[PDB]
Write a protein that binds this ligand. Structure first.
Ligand code: HEM
Length: 214
């Protein structure tokens, strides 16, 4: 569409359906993910968010991103570290895996953050909006399936204490996106990078799904 928010939604409509229909997400949605499979994805998201947020800090003041700087409400690294401590123990740092797909995803994040900051928004959009949408639905499935403490330990990643109304917040995040100044050509590259983002996620779920059945 015209506004970035709508252009992104329109451009990723297909890959999104493909992402939720991946073998791994379907099993997860039916409550058939194992503790080992869950530990794997969370370990992968750790590296992913560590890189993403690393690049966000680098570009937090660049106008091509700045309007979307939400460290207190969205950043996931700290939450993910609490989850690693929970699922892997005090030495999770040297214990967590780092799959090829994960490095490949991380690799793209650092290129974007380093040489194409004007595209970072596509990666933030893909991850954070999903976390406040389907991530919230998956959080409840994980709760019944894994049987974790009602205290929230092990699922800090799915919890956003500063966002009491995710629907409202997503609206504000979209409004901020439509505030970004960029030529029509950069906007197209941004929607395209968003596709890649989903793809990176899709191929990750394919890799992880293959590691489990293995
Ligand atoms: C587990 C399966 C999933 C389900 C059931 C699901 C469900 C949804 C729903 C219902 C919305 C619309 C919320 C709204 O209108 O504000 C949404 C939006 C979104 N989802 Fe998913 N999702 C899933 C997986 C994913 C994955 C794996 C990603 C990314 C890697 C993702 C990324 C997004 C994004 C970026 C949006 C925002 C779209 C926009 O408003 O422009 N989702 N999702």
């Amino acid at each position: 569409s015209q506004d970035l928010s709508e252009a992104l939604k329109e451009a990723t409509k297909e890959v999104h359906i493909r992402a939720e229909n991946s073998e791994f997400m379907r099993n997860f949605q039916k409550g058939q993910v194992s503790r080992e499979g869950f530990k794997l994805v969370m370990a992968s998201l750790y590296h992913i968010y560590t890189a993403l947020e690393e690049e966000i800090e680098r570009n937090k003041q660049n106008p091509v991103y700045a309007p979307l700087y939400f460290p207190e409400e969205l950043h996931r690294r700290a939450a993910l570290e609490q989850d690693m401590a929970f699922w892997y123990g005090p030495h999770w740092q040297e214990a967590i895996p780092y799959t090829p797909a994960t490095q490949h995803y991380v690799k793209r994040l650092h290129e974007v953050g380093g040489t194409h900051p004007e595209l970072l928004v596509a990666h933030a959009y893909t991850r954070y909006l999903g976390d406040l949408s389907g991530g919230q639905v998956l959080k409840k499935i994980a709760q019944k399936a894994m049987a974790l403490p009602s205290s929230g330990e092990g699922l800090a990643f799915f919890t956003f204490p500063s966002i009491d109304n995710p629907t409202k917040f997503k609206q504000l995040y979209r409004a901020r996106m439509n505030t970004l100044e960029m030529t029509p050509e950069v906007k197209h590259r941004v929607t395209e990078e968003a596709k890649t983002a989903f793809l990176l996620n899709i191929e990750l779920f394919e890799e992880l799904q293959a590691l489990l059945t293995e």
